[PDB]
Write a protein that binds this DNA or RNA. Structure first.
Ligand SMILES: [Zn+2]
Lengths: 63, 204, 286, 241, 121, 388
RNA sequence: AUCUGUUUGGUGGAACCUGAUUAGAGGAAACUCAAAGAGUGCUAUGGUAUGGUGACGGAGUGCGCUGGUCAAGAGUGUAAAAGCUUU
RNA sequence: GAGUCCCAUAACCUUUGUACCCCAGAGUGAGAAA
RNA sequence: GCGAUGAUCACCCGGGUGGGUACAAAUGGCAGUCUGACAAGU
């Protein structure tokens, strides 16, 4: 179970690393990524410039 | 025990009357508890023996009263003067503690004061502490009437007069069974109590 | 509870319209007490009727999902349902009147070749309907005649229309010149009022059920509330997280405002910020 | 150790209604509601008070999980004298009787049990203790015994069920007072043996937050139990933030 | 409703009896009602297996009460003859207990059956 | 849209009317949650319109069962019919808030014109009524809700458990605790009777050593001066002349050293001797009851060892359930202080204890135990006895 | 013991250092007089205030409103029906 | 002047008399007989 | 013609010393019965 931080999503997009697949590659195991309201709220406050980051964070596989 | 005899089961509580046993406020309370009682039912075989036990309790209390009345009659014939002063119950214990009337009669009045408190007395005497002042006489009526430090004084006065009356009981060859010596002795202690209690320490 | 009853993957494309209705089937009485139905339309040329299980009442104790699908020749852009009866109207390239018990449009309404971008049924004179065109026009319809009635062309497109719940002949329009216009049905030459506070396009408008206030959503990321007798807003609502207000509605008690922006969140607002929802003692109240 | 003729010093604990018996060894003891008998064979202590012969019972941490919580050092217990406590999962009087001792004559204990065979003794024990109300009913359906229970200050749940979070949820809404207490004993194996204990504890706490119960503290019951923890929370209907 | 409850079905009975047999070879099995009762007192029992045809059944109905008090799983098997045969002794066995041992070679097999018994209860 | 509220009390059914409807969209806001706690705010929401107390304890249990099963009792049907106004089944329905959803379908059947609600909005009102309780009843006689809960709680619980007085074994524990107490008191009082009459006739206490016989004789021979041939026959009838005490007392009363005590003293001796007589008879009556109760409660255990020995064994364990739960070894040491079950002698004792343990299990966990298994189990011990 | 001198407990509290406090530090009394804090108890109940200004009230008539039963009509359905919806 | 309030209406020790006991104790746990 | 519904597992010369549990009695022990002339009022 992995807690995602706001900057983690931004850097993942910069490097073209999928969150779910990238974690499975790193740990060679099923990872259950988790986003808290604070991280979701921080993404929304970043503004229109980070709309792409907000849409990936809302992927259904991310609980 | 008497309630069980009158009503055997909580069901009977509705119609049974507990007036002669209990006051109005108390009897109504048990009736309310009966219908809402948390307990379980019992068979007649159980009830019969619980009644049998209850019959023993009331019969015990009856004979206990009979023995108490018997002891009063004995004390009012073997030491009538003492009974007038200290009472039947406390006087009986004073005789029983010494083991005989003559043995008590030969004791000084100081011992009669502290007769029942040897454990406190001899502990205090050996450890250089203050000694008890009431002994078994604490339960006499006259000591009860006294208050504060006056209880210690009346014990001293009552014990002295008890020895006077007790000796007249034990050593009198032609004693009347009247308690006249005790009655006059009783008046002296009451006068001593009245003036002793009349005094007020606080300035008026 | 701020929780979903159900979620459906209704359409492959964009959901261009939605309305909650109480269907009246000819042969069947739907259980409105235990089930609530919504209609959806989308640019994939289909209108779907859904059923949702609700817990309003406990008189019972399913069939939760798609009930019927209406196919269309062209893409749809708006949908609204007649209040009194089951008929509903969809606006796409042509505004079409539908009946729930028929798979094809029962009637065809259209002033001309221009497409319709939105529509809204009247709330009191239920037979009157209004629509908006891409040609900067507002068209009025009357179902009693099964025909359009009046048309006015404005300087800019109007995105939404709402009818006054307390006044059968008055309706307000959200316009793209940063303004909202209050109109009288019988005399459309002049506006009754103009609301001017916004600084970007006004994308939706709604009346409070009391009929004394309207709320406007704008492209400028704000929500403004107007008194129907004044041409300027009494309030503005905003947040850094709210990104483009596209829909605004009033709660049916007129105490709350529901806004939906393009960041994907549906927010709840107090109609009057300083008020509170608890029941007040007489000493508070006075 | 704590043999028969040994003499001990009884002093009060930080929690009201709980005591400590000092000596070569320390014992957690509670005043006996029904003197002269033992519910489950625990040792007892008699004190001659001016004289009346008062009695105390020993609380074994290895038998009661609430007792293990006292040893481990719980900061706040809402179970205190003169309070109503709703006890869920009351298998028998092993722990309810000690809770009945703490609340005292003025308090009440609503003991809820499902299985009948443990239930029968709970009835028999309850009749020695007037302040215990046994409710032989399933805790998953509080509607069945809503007549029997009024508002309660604290809710104690020892149910070892996978869906205990819902059971604690429903009971609190009906009977627990606002700002009241909630005490839960969580055994990881019953809830989910597939995952580690830490994952289970984090999951149960999240459910309680969702149910308007604010957790105050968490404690694991070692060395008395393995893979157990007690979560103490408060029922904040108004809001947890 | 019947006194012997729950009663394992045919598929589960064989799975239980296999664990009983392996436990006997590994000295992790206690045989007999009296021995089973002791293990519950010490809290060293993974679960209790009882025979449902014990004549009379009541002479082992105390174990479920002890089990529920201690929260120990239990289950009934149809035959005491079969249970005795699996236990490894030459006589029928009405009750048996699997001793707890965290260093045993049959941990997974025991816990697999233990989980199924919990579902049955 | 809630207009009426149904609340079920241990004492009866209460119907309220909702004067104001609380906000539903803002239900989770703090101020709407606090108003439930505040009585000043709550009283503006609802008002009591009717209350129908149960007739008695019996009716309360029946309606507790019906409410538990989601059924509408006749009492509930009456109060609802009296209060709820008649409305259409389709056009518009009176709304009733009920705590339990299972109770909704039942009320709908009886009253087609009422729609039941148990959503979170309804629960909040029900929570408030429970919270403030008797304060809302404007003094109407609701008894005391806390006390009736205790009575109804035990009733409901035992009815499901089907608890019976037949399963009761504490009567055995009381009887044994009383029986030995009587055996002590009868002896202690009888010894005193010997002393008191010893003063008046000291030798007679030597003549009749058996205390019970001595008391009955003293009741007859109150004064040793009274000695008649007919009296000799009457006391000769007491017990038998085989010992010759009838002649000894007459000859010995004539020449004895006992100092005559007063009439009042003799009155105490005979009454106190009469007292020893009553307890002896009561003790035998109780002893038969213990024997009878043992057969009913534990026929197997009583038959295997005996009623008294079984009663002592149950008391030592503290209860029949406690005795059953013990292992065989513990049962053996349970009777190892009084030798209840008593190298080859020990082997029988260990063998007998195991059988006694099983006998207890049959008795404790059988609603109506028989003595069929006790007989064969005792028979098995007899064969073991003969073998050893 | 004109033996010994350590430990335990009490009495006492120089110097240096450290901390806190300072119109020095305390004590007793109360059906005394003040200024404040916290908690608890109490139907603590007008969501728009009595049926009523002869400006009125009561009795009765009509209108209006409510419930289900019946009949007919419309729609749906059928070979014909039965059955269902109806502001 | 002076501790009833640690049951002298009692506790403990000793002697005598009476009735039982000399295997493990949270007892062990698959042998026994041939 | 067995068994998990349970196999197996102090001293001294027929006699006397050693130890344990329970109860009762003892006119057996601890174990020795406080002080002694002032006090209260005007
Ligand atoms: Zn957070």
């Amino acid at each position: 179970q992995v807690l995602i931080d706001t900057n983690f999503i931004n850097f993942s997009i910069q490097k073209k690393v999928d969150i779910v697949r990238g974690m499975m590659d790193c740990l060679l195991a099923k990872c259950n990524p988790l986003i808290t309201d604070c991280v979701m709220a921080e993404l929304e406050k970043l503004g229109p410039k980070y709309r792409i980051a907000l849409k990936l964070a809302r992927d259904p596989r991310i609980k | 025990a008497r309630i069980i005899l009158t009503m055997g089961i909580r069901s009977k509580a509705s119609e049974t009357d507990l007036s002669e046993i209990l006051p109005e406020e108390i009897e109504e309370r048990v009736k309310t508890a009966a219908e809402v009682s948390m307990g379980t039912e019992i068979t007649q075989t159980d009830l019969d023996n619980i009644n049998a036990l209850a019959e023993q309790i009331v019969e015990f209390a009856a004979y206990r009263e009979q023995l108490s009345n018997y002891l009063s009659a004995r004390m009012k014939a073997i030491a009538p003067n003492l009974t007038q002063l200290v009472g039947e119950l406390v006087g009986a214990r004073l005789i029983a503690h010494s083991g005989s009337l003559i043995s008590l009669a030969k004791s000084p009045a100081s011992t009669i004061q502290i007769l029942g408190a040897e454990k406190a007395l001899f502990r205090a005497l050996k450890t250089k502490h203050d000694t008890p002042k009431y002994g078994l006489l604490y339960h006499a009526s006259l000591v009860g009437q006294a208050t504060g430090k006056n209880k210690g004084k009346i014990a001293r006065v009552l014990a002295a007069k008890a020895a006077v009356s007790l000796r007249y009981d034990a050593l009198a060859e032609d004693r009347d069974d009247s308690g006249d010596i005790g009655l006059e002795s009783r008046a002296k202690v009451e006068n001593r109590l009245s003036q002793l209690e009349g005094r007020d320490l606080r300035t008026t | 509870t701020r929780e979903e009853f159900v979620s459906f993957k209704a359409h492959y494309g964009l959901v261009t319209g939605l309305c909650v209705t109480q269907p009246r089937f000819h042969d069947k009485k739907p259980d409105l007490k235990s089930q609530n139905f919504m209609l959806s339309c989308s640019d994939d040329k289909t209108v779907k009727l859904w059923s949702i299980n609700v817990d309003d009442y406990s008189n019972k104790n399913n069939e939760e999902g798609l009930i019927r699908t209406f196919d269309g020749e062209s893409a749809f852009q708006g949908i609204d349902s007649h209040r009194e009866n089951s008929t509903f109207a969809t606006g796409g390239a042509k505004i079409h009147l539908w009946d729930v018990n028929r798979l094809k449009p029962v009637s065809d309404l259209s002033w001309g070749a221009d497409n319709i971008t939105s529509l809204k049924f009247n709330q009191n004179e239920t037979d009157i309907l209004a629509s908006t065109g891409s040609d900067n026009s507002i068209v009025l319809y009357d179902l009693r005649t099964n025909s359009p009635t009046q048309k006015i062309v404005q300087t800019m497109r109007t995105n939404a229309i709402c009818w006054n719940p307390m006044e059968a002949f008055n309706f307000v329009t959200a316009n793209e010149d940063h303004n909202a216009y209050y109109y009288d049905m019988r005399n459309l030459s002049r506006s009754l009022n103009v609301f001017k506070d916004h600084v970007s396009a006004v994308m939706d408008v709604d009346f409070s059920p009391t009929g004394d206030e309207i709320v406007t959503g704008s492209y400028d990321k704000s929500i403004r509330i107007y008194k129907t007798n004044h041409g300027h807003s009494r309030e503005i609502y905003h947040t850094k997280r709210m990104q483009h207000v596209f829909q605004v509605k009033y709660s049916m008690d007129s105490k709350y405002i529901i806004s939906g922006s393009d960041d994907g969140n549906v927010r709840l607002w107090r109609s009057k910020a300083w008020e509170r929802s608890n029941v007040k003692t007489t000493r508070e109240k006075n | 150790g704590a043999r028969g003729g040994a003499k001990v010093v009884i002093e009060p604990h930080r929690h009201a209604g709980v005591y400590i018996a000092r000596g070569k060894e320390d014992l957690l003891v509670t005043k006996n509601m029904a003197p002269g008998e033992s519910v489950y064979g625990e040792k007892r202590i008699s004190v001659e008070e001016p004289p009346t012969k008062v009695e105390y019972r020993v609380w074994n941490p290895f038998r009661s999980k609430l007792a293990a919580g006292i040893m481990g050092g719980l900061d706040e217990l809402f179970i205190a004298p003169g309070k109503k406590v709703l006890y869920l999962g009351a298998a028998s009087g092993t722990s309810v009787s000690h809770v009945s001792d703490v609340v005292g004559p003025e308090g009440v204990v609503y003991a809820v049990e499902f299985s009948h065979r443990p239930g029968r003794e709970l009835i028999s024990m309850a009749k020695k203790r007037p302040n215990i109300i046994p409710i032989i009913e399933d805790a998953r359906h509080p509607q069945k015994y809503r007549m029997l229970i009024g508002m309660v200050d604290c809710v104690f749940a020892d149910v070892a069920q996978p869906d205990q979070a819902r059971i604690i949820a429903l009971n609190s809404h009906m009977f627990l007072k606002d700002q009241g207490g909630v005490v839960i004993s969580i055994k990881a194996n019953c809830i989910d043996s597939t995952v580690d204990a830490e994952t289970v504890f984090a999951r149960e706490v999240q459910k309680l937050r969702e149910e308007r119960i604010k957790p105050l503290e968490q404690l694991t019951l070692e060395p008395y139990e393995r893979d157990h923890c007690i979560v103490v929370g408060r029922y904040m209907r108004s809001g947890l933030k | 409703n019947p006194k012997a409850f729950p009663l394992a079905d045919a598929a589960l009975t064989q799975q239980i009896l296999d664990v009983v047999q392996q436990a006997a070879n590994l000295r992790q099995l206690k045989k007999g009602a009296n021995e089973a009762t002791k293990t519950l007192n010490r809290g060293i029992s993974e679960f209790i297996i009882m025979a449902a045809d014990c004549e009379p059944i009541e002479i082992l109905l105390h174990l479920p009460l002890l089990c529920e008090d201690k929260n120990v799983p239990y289950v009934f098997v149809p035959s005491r003859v079969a249970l005795g045969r699996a236990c490894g002794v030459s006589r029928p066995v009405i009750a048996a207990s699997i001793t707890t041992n965290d260093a045993s070679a049959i941990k997974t097999q025991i816990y697999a059956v233990k989980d199924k018994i919990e579902t049955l209860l | 849209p809630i207009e009426y509220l149904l609340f079920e009390e241990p004492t009866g059914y209460a119907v309220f009317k909702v004067k104001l409807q609380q906000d539903d969209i803002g239900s989770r806001l703090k101020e709407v949650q606090e108003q439930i706690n505040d009585f000043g705010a709550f009283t503006k929401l609802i008002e009591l319109v009717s209350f129908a107390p149960f007739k008695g304890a019996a009716e309360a249990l029946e309606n507790a069962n019906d409410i538990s099963e989601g059924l509408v009792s006749e009492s509930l049907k009456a109060i609802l019919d009296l209060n709820l106004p008649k409305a259409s089944s389709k056009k518009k329905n009176i709304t009733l808030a009920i705590s339990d959803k299972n109770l909704g379908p039942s009320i709908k059947e009886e009253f087609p014109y009422v729609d039941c609600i148990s959503n979170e909005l309804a629960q909040d009102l029900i929570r408030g009524v429970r919270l403030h309780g008797e304060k809302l009843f404007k003094g109407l006689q609701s008894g005391d809700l806390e006390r009736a809960q205790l009575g109804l709680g035990h009733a409901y619980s035992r009815a499901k458990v089907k608890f019976s007085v037949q399963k009761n074994d504490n009567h055995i524990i009381q009887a044994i605790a009383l029986l030995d107490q009587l055996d002590k008191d009868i002896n202690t009082f009888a010894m005193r009777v010997k002393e008191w009459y010893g003063w008046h006739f000291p030798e007679l206490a030597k003549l009749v050593p058996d205390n019970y016989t001595f008391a009955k004789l003293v009741l007859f021979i109150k004064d040793k001066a009274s000695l008649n041939d007919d009296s000799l026959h009457d006391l000769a009838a007491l017990l038998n002349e085989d010992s010759g005490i009838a002649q000894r007392v007459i000859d010995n009363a004539r020449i004895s050293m006992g100092q005559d005590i007063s009439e009042t003293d003799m009155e105490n001796v005979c009454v106190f001797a009469q007292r020893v007589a009553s307890l002896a008879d009561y003790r035998r009556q109780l002893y038969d009851y213990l024997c009878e109760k043992m057969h009913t409660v534990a026929p197997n255990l009583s038959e295997l060892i005996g009623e008294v020995i079984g009663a002592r064994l149950i008391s030592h364990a503290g209860s029949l359930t406690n005795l059953s739960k013990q292992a065989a070894s513990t049962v053996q040491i349970l009777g190892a202080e009084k030798a209840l079950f008593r190298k080859n002698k020990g082997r029988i004792s260990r063998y007998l204890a195991n059988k006694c343990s099983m006998a207890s299990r049959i008795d404790n966990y059988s609603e109506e135990p028989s003595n069929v298994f006790g007989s064969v189990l005792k028979k098995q011990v007899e064969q073991r006895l003969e073998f050893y």
